[PDB]
Write an enzyme that holds these catalytic residues in place. Structure first.
Site, PDB file in Angstrom:
ATOM      1  N   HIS A 552       0.833  -1.202   0.000  1.00 45.75           N
ATOM      2  CA  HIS A 552       0.000   0.000   0.000  1.00 45.75           C
ATOM      3  C   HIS A 552       0.873   1.258   0.000  1.00 45.75           C
ATOM      4  CE1 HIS A 552      -2.845  -3.082   1.632  1.00 45.75           C
ATOM      5  NE2 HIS A 552      -3.648  -2.477   0.778  1.00 45.75           N
ATOM      6  N   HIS A 592      -7.056   7.467  -1.475  1.00 46.94           N
ATOM      7  CA  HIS A 592      -7.949   6.627  -0.687  1.00 46.94           C
ATOM      8  C   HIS A 592      -7.201   5.868   0.402  1.00 46.94           C
ATOM      9  CE1 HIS A 592      -6.144   3.639  -3.224  1.00 46.94           C
ATOM     10  NE2 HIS A 592      -6.877   2.660  -2.723  1.00 46.94           N
ATOM     11  N   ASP A 593      -5.922   5.565   0.185  1.00 52.91           N
ATOM     12  CA  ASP A 593      -5.091   4.849   1.147  1.00 52.91           C
ATOM     13  C   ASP A 593      -3.849   5.660   1.500  1.00 52.91           C
ATOM     14  OD1 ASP A 593      -5.975   2.157   2.127  1.00 52.91           O
ATOM     15  OD2 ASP A 593      -6.285   1.811  -0.016  1.00 52.91           O
TER      16      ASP A 593
HETATM   17 MG    MG Z   1      -7.732   0.672   2.017  1.00 49.73          MG
HETATM   18 ZN    ZN Z   2      -6.542   0.707  -1.556  1.00 51.22          ZN
END
Ligand code: MG
Ligand code: ZN
Ligand code: 35G
Ligand code: 35G
Ligand code: MG
Ligand code: ZN
EC number: 3.1.4.35
Lengths: 820, 807, 46, 48
Positions: A552, A592-593
């Site tokens: 991520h 979003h992350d």
């Molecule tokens: Mg997420």
């Molecule tokens: Zn994500």
């Protein structure tokens, strides 16, 4: 004629005379008529006039009572019945926990006016409780008679010579209100006898009943008034302390100023001490060196300097005047007397009855005010903040009545300073919140600076420093467009608007340029007039916001953003969504992350992370929501500056919808509310214009937004195998890292995917994820839009090629077991 | 039966027996015979009420013989009370006759006949507060028959007065018949007003005692509630439960339960999808007046009869023994203090008629009130279900419980502040975590200092100190190539990466890494993290901090200032001087006051010097970045104290105030001829060493003025550039006029400012230390050289402006 | 009934109508030593 | 003015001694949901 023998014989005319004249026999007696008892004669013995004098005693029970005239009349009559002179009513009060006995009626004899038998509180003799027969009666609580006072124990003659009297004999009897003494009546000498007889005690007791229950009325009334006022002071202060939350000074001033009337005192003042306990490091060197000789004055019991930095005083006897004297001088009228500093040193409830006779403290002896007002009665007590350390000293001066403070009066404000000391919790909490919020702001500013594109690396993309010669924030908007055209990659060549796009060849900085370009391809920068410099800065800062964790990282965010951008422009999903809504969706998908720690929500719950203790549900999603807007809230980094209020309130509102909805738990709960919309889309036969109903309807659009957030986050399955395999390896490595972190930190066994030694089972637990979590959204959209058909081909092929490994491992395990 | 003539027979006959009626005591006539008996009876009555007030028992005797004087058939006392704003006259003593015992006339609390304000003369008198005499009861417009049909009685002649305590009526007593007379001859009215006058004295005593007890109870409960509200900041549930449980012997109740209302005002974005998605039918029940939904999520009930049995319901059902009545959900619908006479005989609320438990518990009196939180928002409903005395709730109990609930409702600011403080603390923790991640150096970037994946195959964490040191012995520089042992250590030659290695090497020179057994990995990581801590601003960056650290290390080693301090007190200095400028934003201390920065609000004096200390201590607080882990508690505390004296002391404002003591110490150094004994003298004193250390704290950060003029010119240019940046940033954000050294257009008059700075701030630390030690003379000599160079430049510019004046 | 005065159970009132509840009370409560301090003010200090 | 007690000014006490003051009283207060065929399917993955 006269032969009415029924009247003649006894016991008949009585019951007729009653019925007729009994009311008029009683009516006149209870009226205002004076007693018909001769007082000139002395040994009357009261044959039938005993009843006449009883009626007079009952004649003053009407509802006009002051408890002075009636008792005085009772004592006048008792001086005649008792055959003795000079009665006296010694009142009972208590101060400082030690009782006193002050006279109220002195030298009372028959045929005396009340004006010359009543003593004002200004000049009243006050004997103690531990000496004299007055104290003996007060302690023994019974009637005593001591003939020939000069040969009996515990007799004090202080007032015998003061009033030039003899007091050959003494008879005293207390009056009590339920085990509590209220007064003591005294009798001295016998007019025509050697000493009081035994029957005189019975006479006094029998005629004292009327005066015993008439003082009780006044005592109960006074107690009731005191209790009512105490109840009021504790309820008028809660309101003013709970209006808001402020510092100690103003809160105390408000609470004390609002309850001024109940504290019926001519003046009072409250002084506040400096609360610092330890001097600063640089303020201690001079004392040790030799300069600034050290303090040697008074100190509090807990070891602090007694410095009154503010003394608030309230004046009410004349004209109302409330003033504050910061840093009052030591010769302040409230501080000239040593009482405040003495209370600070000790902390006792000091009660002083007279200033003129005061020796230890030596109060003022001159009227302070222009009009005559001299300090006579003083009551001072400290304020402790629940740990027996003095916060301040409150001193209450002369009462509005004139009598010295008693126990019922001391307990009035003794329960108020307790309230003030207890209330310190709010002034304390006032400073902690400010300090804590300032620290929060400071650290937020630190992190904000850390994640931000400064002037040194902004030139890496937008370089006006050499080709133009000046820094970007001075170039014109039209003058700023040319420098981007030759740098931003073309969308057509770089394959940034099609479902099959891989960023592995592209550099880390290249994705920022692609994201910058993707806004232009929507033709949204021009119409909203958002600055290009701010857009470039925000796009570059988004890259730094993401962490360097395995999966991520910034690359995943850009991949999700590109998936959304493709779904809009090549998927023909732009028809339902307004242009501003596209502006919101693309930027919501890009961050979003943002700032992902690397552990899922379950680890947040398990480890009691500070994120978990603040967000109830969807901890990571809400955290990324509240951090991506912080970067977008400041100038020089915001892209919503040129948006009017309603569009701004719309755009931000749907960032909550998108960013929060990316949670998988929130997806599964409301998965079946989109299939109904899809079914509604296939019932508008005879045309492809189901879009028009979508456009207005809205809530359908919001659900579609929340459904294409879940179709972009887990879009790694849809990519060709050559990228899906690597992405699966990376996510498996991230899960293994989370499992390793959880095993040691929390001491528990993780779920199978987070275990390292279950790596060989990755394909079979990946096909399950593809079949359960995936292949529903990507089937519903495929059946709902025909323009996004390639995504399901890339899911079917990927699952087909995953089953190859999932079965290879199964054959390996079967063979190994067959070896056994 | 005579009519009027026999008026001179009764009294004038003077009972001519001296013993008639059986026994006299000295009476003369009939008029003197009734008098003595009446006086004796009244005195006995007075003696009865002397102590242990018994209102009913004595008022019954007063009425027993008051009826006969009036010839009234019956006499009855009617008590007075108030409920929810409307008065009510209960029936305490009824039908008192001369031939009745007390228990025959007393009415128990469960047998009252209460009358409202207006219905009947009993209420008309209460409204009027005066006497009324009705000759015939059919004539008067207002008269009730509800006390006629039950009693099977008929009334035709009334006589009533109210008992008043000041302006508050206490009761009303009414004779109901005349017997031998049609219209209550007025002669009886006066005696009734008078014979009952001293009987009023006891009713008011009882009322006063009752009021005193009620107000004492109110004071006690308020004081206890204020006591336990301020104990600590806790959530609403615990605070309310504590304040309610702590005061339960004063309420004189049997059962009472407190319900809490859910405070979710506005639903969240996805909560309300189904309601308009063709499912999940919307709520249709009652609503709180402010507009919320009524939903009791936690109900705490207290039982005071038999056993305490205190229990909490975490999610009460609709059939709860408290919420089933429907009253708790009605007080939430609107804010009313509901009061009930007879719970079983009610229609609006469905109170259970039968018992609840084996003990046989039946509710009879209920009183429910809301808990408003100063915002007119209902927070809960507290219901009290009976009284221990058995009498129905009066007005005094209403006032008491209203005061309690009002205080508790006001006491919601504490819980709100608790929640706000928790949220702020969590946000600060999250921000600190972000900053720590962005400052700490990751694994992939620590390989620049010590490469262990290349030399070895193991991660840096998975290595031994002996093996870790092998890499350092080669990568780290020597003490001669970068000459960190000189007063003219040029900085711009080396890149920022070499400065970290130089810092590690000078940490090795002190012989401190092996003395306190600190770990090498943590030391390297701490140096890299502190290097990353500094900003990228023009001057106050990692270069300046490392220059200060190196200058102070040179002072300690080649300046022979290390003799006074031990090795531990030298560990706490080279670390404190290396991070003293760690989070500088360019703006000086004075700017924080004028810009209202959060730094100014947090710290009173030394706004920015006192702020670097907290960040520096935060960096070395967490493990894997803390080089003081192995130190024991005493050494760790000493190091903390040394750093907190060091970093703050670098402020120039504190320098000006506290220079005289250093001058005195330097002067005192001159009476000790043997400088080898001044070391012994000064190696023990604490405050003297603290002063010297705080002085060398600011004698090194003011350096770069004692360096060769080639370096000095560039350093001065950088400092001037930073000051000009601050000044330019000050005339737009603050819209003020910068001081002359902060004017970018005032750059020409730079050298004169430099010479003014040298002769005022400098040349004191560099002269006293030169006098204190001759070992540190070169810095003073170079300072004077630079001062003369800058004076030459200032004179050149003076000549230029003079030519402009006299060209 | 003989025990009480023709009344049992709970108290009885001669009133028939809607009960009226209380409306609640909402109105009762509502420089350090220096020859000339500003010689150093021209610089950053104060 | 007779004054009854024959004393004026202020209250007069027979004995004289150093003031004694009451101690503070502290002996009373400070005495210190999913609709499912089965739920474990989500538990296999990161959900729930
Ligand atoms: Mg997420
Ligand atoms: Zn994500
Ligand atoms: N003049 C006067 N003195 C009284 C009277 N009653 C009591 N005293 C004095 O007050 C004193 C109180 O206690 P002593 O030893 O008991 O003796 C008493 C008398 O000297 C009174 O009626 N008149
Ligand atoms: N003493 C007495 N009073 C009664 C009796 N019956 C009724 N009353 C009172 O007489 C009053 C007449 O009307 P009132 O308001 O209507 O209320 C009635 C009661 O207070 C009785 O038997 N004895
Ligand atoms: Mg500094
Ligand atoms: Zn510095």
């Amino acid at each position: 004629e006269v032969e009415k023998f029924l009247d003649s014989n006894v016991s008949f005319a009585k019951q007729y005379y009653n019925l007729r004249y009994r009311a008029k026999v009683i009516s006149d007696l209870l009226g205002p008529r004076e007693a018909a008892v001769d007082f000139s004669n002395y040994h009357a013995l009261n044959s039938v006039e005993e009843s006449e004098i009883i009626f007079d005693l009952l004649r003053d029970f009407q509802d006009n009572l002051q408890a002075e005239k009636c008792v005085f009349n009772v004592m006048k009559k008792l001086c005649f019945l008792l055959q003795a002179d000079r009665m006296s009513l010694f009142m009972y009060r208590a101060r400082n926990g030690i009782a006193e006995l002050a006279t109220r009626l002195f030298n009372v004899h028959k045929d005396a006016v009340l004006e010359e038998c009543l003593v004002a509180p200004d000049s009243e003799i006050v004997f103690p409780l531990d000496m004299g027969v007055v104290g003996h009666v007060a302690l023994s609580k019974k009637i005593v008679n001591v003939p020939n006072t000069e040969e009996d124990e515990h007799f004090c003659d202080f007032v015998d010579t003061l009033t030039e009297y003899q007091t050959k004999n003494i008879l005293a009897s207390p009056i009590m209100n339920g085990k509590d003494v209220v007064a003591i009546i005294m009798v001295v000498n016998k007019v025509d006898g050697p000493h009081f007889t035994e029957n005189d005690e019975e006479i006094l007791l029998k005629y004292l009943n009327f005066a015993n229950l008439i003082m009780k009325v006044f005592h109960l009334s006074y107690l009731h008034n005191c209790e009512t006022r105490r109840g009021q002071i504790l309820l008028w202060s809660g309101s003013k302390v709970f209006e808001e939350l402020t510092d100690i000074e103003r809160q105390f001033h408000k609470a004390l100023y609002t309850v001024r009337a109940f504290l019926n005192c001519d003046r009072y003042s409250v002084g506040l001490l400096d609360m610092t306990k330890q001097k600063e490091f640089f303020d201690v060197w001079p004392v040790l060196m030799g300069e600034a000789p050290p303090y040697a004055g008074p100190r509090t019991p807990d070891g602090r300097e007694i410095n009154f930095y503010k003394v608030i005083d309230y004046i009410l006897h004349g004209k109302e005047d409330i003033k504050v004297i910061p840093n009052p001088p030591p010769d302040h009228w409230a501080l000239v007397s040593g009482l405040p500093t003495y209370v600070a040193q000790n902390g006792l409830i000091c009660n002083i009855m007279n200033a003129p006779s005061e020796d230890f403290f030596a109060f003022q002896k001159e009227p302070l005010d222009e009009s005559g007002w001299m300090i006579k009665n003083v009551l001072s007590m400290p304020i402790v903040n629940k740990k027996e350390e003095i916060v301040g000293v409150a001193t209450f001066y002369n009462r509005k009545d004139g009598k010295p403070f008693d126990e019922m009066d001391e307990t009035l404000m003794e329960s108020l300073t307790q309230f003030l000391g207890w209330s310190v919790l709010n002034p304390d909490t006032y400073e902690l919140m400010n300090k804590l919020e300032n620290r929060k702001d400071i650290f937020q500013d630190m992190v904000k600076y850390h994640v931000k594109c400064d002037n040194e690396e902004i030139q890496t993309i937008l370089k006006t420093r050499e080709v133009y010669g000046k820094e970007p924030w001075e170039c014109e908007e039209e003058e700023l467009a040319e420098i981007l055209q030759g740098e931003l990659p073309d969308a057509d060549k770089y394959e940034i608007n099609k479902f099959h796009f891989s960023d592995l060849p592209l550099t880390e900085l290249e994705l920022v340029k692609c994201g910058i370009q993707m806004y232009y391809e929507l033709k949204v920068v021009d119409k909203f007039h958002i600055p290009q410099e701010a857009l470039v800065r925000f796009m570059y800062s988004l890259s730094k916001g993401y962490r360097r964790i395995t999966y991520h990282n910034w690359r995943h965010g850009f991949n999700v953003g590109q998936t959304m951008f493709s779904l809009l422009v090549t998927g023909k999903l732009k028809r339902y969504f307004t242009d501003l809504e596209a502006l919101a969706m693309v930027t919501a998908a890009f961050c979003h992350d943002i700032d992902h720690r690397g552990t899922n929500n379950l680890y947040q719950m398990k480890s009691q992370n500070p994120l978990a203790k603040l967000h109830g549900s969807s901890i990571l999603e809400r955290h990324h929501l509240e951090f991506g807007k912080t970067l977008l809230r400041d100038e020089s980094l915001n892209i919503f500056q040129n948006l009017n209020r309603r569009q701004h309130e719309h755009a931000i509102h749907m960032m909550d919808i998108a960013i929060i909805a990316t949670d998988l738990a929130l997806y599964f709960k409301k998965r079946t509310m989109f299939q109904k919309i899809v079914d509604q889309s296939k019932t508008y036969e005879t045309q492809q214009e189901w879009t028009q109903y979508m456009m207005l309807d809205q809530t359908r659009k919001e659900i579609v937004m929340a459904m294409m957030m879940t179709a972009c986050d887990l879009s790694a399955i849809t990519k060709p195998w050559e990228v899906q395999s690597k992405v699966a390896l990376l996510v498996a490595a991230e899960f293994w890292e989370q499992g390793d972190l959880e095993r040691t930190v929390l001491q528990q066994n993780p779920i199978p995917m987070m275990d390292r030694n279950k790596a060989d089972e990755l394909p079979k637990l990946q096909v399950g994820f593809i079949d359960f979590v995936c292949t529903f959204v990507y089937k519903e959209f495929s059946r709902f839009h025909e323009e996004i058909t390639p995504m399901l081909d890339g899911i079917t092929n990927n699952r087909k090629e995953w089953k190859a490994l999932a079965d290879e491992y199964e054959t390996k395990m079967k063979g190994l077991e067959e070896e056994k | 039966f005579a009519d009027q003539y026999f008026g001179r027979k009764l009294s004038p006959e003077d009972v001519a027996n001296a013993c008639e009626d059986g026994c006299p005591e000295g009476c003369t006539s009939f008029r003197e015979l009734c008098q003595v008996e009446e006086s004796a009876a009244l005195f006995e009555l007075v003696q009865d009420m002397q102590e242990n007030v018994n209102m009913e028992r004595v008022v019954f005797k007063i009425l027993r013989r008051l009826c006969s004087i009036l010839h009234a058939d019956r006499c009855s006392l009617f008590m007075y009370r108030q409920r929810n704003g409307v008065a009510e006259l209960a029936t305490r003593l009824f039908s008192v006759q001369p031939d009745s015992v007390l228990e025959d006339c007393l009415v128990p609390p469960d047998s009252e006949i209460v009358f409202p304000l207006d219905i009947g003369v009993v209420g008309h008198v209460a409204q009027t507060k005066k006497m009324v005499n009705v000759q015939d009861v059919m004539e008067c417009p207002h008269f009730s028959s509800f006390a006629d049909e039950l009693t099977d009685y008929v009334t035709r002649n009334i006589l009533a007065t109210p008992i008043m305590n000041g302006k508050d009526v206490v009761a009303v007593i009414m004779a109901v018949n005349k017997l031998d007379g049609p219209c209550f001859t007025s002669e009886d009215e006066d005696v009734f007003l008078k014979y009952l006058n001293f009987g009023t004295l006891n009713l008011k005593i009882y009322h006063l005692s009752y009021l005193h007890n009620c107000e004492t109870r109110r004071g006690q409960v308020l004081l206890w509630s204020a006591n336990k509200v301020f104990e600590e900041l806790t959530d609403i549930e615990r605070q309310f439960h504590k304040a309610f449980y702590t005061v339960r012997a004063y309420l004189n109740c049997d059962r009472y339960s407190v319900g809490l209302l859910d405070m979710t005002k506005e639903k969240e974005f996805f909560d309300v999808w189904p309601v308009l998605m063709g499912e999940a039918q919307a709520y249709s029940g009652p609503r709180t007046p402010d507009g919320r939904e009524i939903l009791f999520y936690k109900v705490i009930d207290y039982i005071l009869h038999g056993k305490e049995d205190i229990k909490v319901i975490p999610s009460p059902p609709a059939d709860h023994w408290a919420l089933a009545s429907g009253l708790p959900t009605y007080v939430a619908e609107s804010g009313f203090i509901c009061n009930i006479m007879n719970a079983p005989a009610d229609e609006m609320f469905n109170f259970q008629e039968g018992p609840l438990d084996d003990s046989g518990w039946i509710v009879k009196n209920v009183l429910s009130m809301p808990i408003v939180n100063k915002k007119e928002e209902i927070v809960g409903v507290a219901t009290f279900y009976n009284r221990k005395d058995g009498k129905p709730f009066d007005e005094q109990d209403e006032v008491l419980m209203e005061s309690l609930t009002q205080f508790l409702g006001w006491s919601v600011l504490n819980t709100d502040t608790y929640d706000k403080m928790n949220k702020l603390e969590n946000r600060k923790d999250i921000a600190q975590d972000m900053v720590l991640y962005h400052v700490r150096c990751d694994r992939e970037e620590i390989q620049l200092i010590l490469p262990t994946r290349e030399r070895l195959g193991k991660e840096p964490a998975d290595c031994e100190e002996d093996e870790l040191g092998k890499i350092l012995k080669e990568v780290l520089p020597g003490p001669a190539k970068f000459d960190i042992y000189e007063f003219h250590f040029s900085d711009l030659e080396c890149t920022e990466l070499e400065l970290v290695k130089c810092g590690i090497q000078m940490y090795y020179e002190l012989g401190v890494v092996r003395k306190f057994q600190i770990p090498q990995e943590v030391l390297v990581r701490f140096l890299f993290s502190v290097s990353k801590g500094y900003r990228r601003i023009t001057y106050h960056n990692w270069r300046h901090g490392f220059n200060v650290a190196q200058t102070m290390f040179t002072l300690l080693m080649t300046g022979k200032l290390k003799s006074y301090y031990t090795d531990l007190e030298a560990f706490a200095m080279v670390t404190a001087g290396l991070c003293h400028d760690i989070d500088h934003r360019g703006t000086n201390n004075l700017y924080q006051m004028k810009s209202q920065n959060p730094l100014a609000k947090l710290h009173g004096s030394s706004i920015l010097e006192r702020h670097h200390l907290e960040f520096g201590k935060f960096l070395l607080s967490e493990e894997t970045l803390n080089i003081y882990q192995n130190l024991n508690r005493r050494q760790h505390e000493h190091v903390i104290h040394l750093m907190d004296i060091a970093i703050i002391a670098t402020d120039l404002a504190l320098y000006f105030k506290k220079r005289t003591m250093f001058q005195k110490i330097v002067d005192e150094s001159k009476n000790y001829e043997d400088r080898k004994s001044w070391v012994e003298y000064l190696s023990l004193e604490t405050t003297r060493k603290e002063i010297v250390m705080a002085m060398m704290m600011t004698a090194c950060d003011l350096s770069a003025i004692t360096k060769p003029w080639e370096v000095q010119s560039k350093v001065a240019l950088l400092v001037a550039a930073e000051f000009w940046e601050q000044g330019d940033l000050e005339r737009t954000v603050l819209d003020q006029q910068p001081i002359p050294m902060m004017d970018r257009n005032k750059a020409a008059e730079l050298p004169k400012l430099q010479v003014g700075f040298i002769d005022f701030v400098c040349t004191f630390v560099y002269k006293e230390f030169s006098r204190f030690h001759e070992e540190i003379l070169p810095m003073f000599d170079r300072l004077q050289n630079n001062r003369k160079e800058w004076k030459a430049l200032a004179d050149e510019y003076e000549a230029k402006v003079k030519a402009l004046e006299e060209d | 009934i003989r025990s009480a005065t023709r009344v049992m159970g709970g108290p009885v009132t001669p009133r028939k109508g809607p009960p009226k509840f209380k409306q609640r009370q909402t109105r009762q409560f509502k420089a350090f030593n220096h020859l000339e301090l500003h010689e150093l003010a021209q610089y950053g200090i104060i």
